[PDB]
């Protein structure tokens with residue numbers, strides 16, 4: 001029917017169908033468009049107190065809770081989707097991963113190299129698509145597939 005991971009869902013507030021991807025946590029009103037050995041992705045990471053390494057170039061000690069990190073991620077998604085900001089601009093300014101200095105680019109990778117949730121979300125994205133929140137041992141990510 002739909003591309004991998006995508007399902008129809010019902011909007012509580014509106015009563016209209018929407019589309020949800022349980023691999024990427026993407027959601028959208030529009031029916032999705034239309035696997036490679038490698039993908040290239042950029043990401044924005046928000047760390048929290050339980051991150052594998054709760055420290056970053058932004059903050060020597062990261063003290064926010066997981067719930068606070070998810071709210072930050074949700075806010076960044078809203079700003080990107082509204083057109084207020086672009087993905088890589090927010091990654092350069094606010095990502096807790098050292099890749100922030102390269103607009104969040106992680107380069108190209110195959111299956112079997114990244115943390116599995118990150119990998120699975122990345123390979124279910126099409127070029128130009130963004131994930132919803134992706135949870136790993138590093139923290140909470142949003143992912144942009146660039147190639």
Ligand SMILES: CC(=O)c1cc[nH]n1
Nearest residue numbers: 050051066136137139
């Ligand atoms: C160990 C734990 O609760 C957690 C939640 C996210 N990352 N780690």
Ligand SMILES: CC(=O)c1cc[nH]n1
Nearest residue numbers: 066067068070135140
């Ligand atoms: C799973 C996780 O990190 C989280 C934080 C808030 N809700 N869920």
Ligand SMILES: CC(=O)c1cc[nH]n1
Nearest residue numbers: 086087088128129130
């Ligand atoms: C460039 C950018 O912000 C974006 C978000 C989704 N796809 N691209």
Ligand SMILES: CC(=O)c1cc[nH]n1
Nearest residue numbers: 113114115118136138
């Ligand atoms: C393995 C690695 O560096 C990774 C996984 C998700 N993000 N970064």
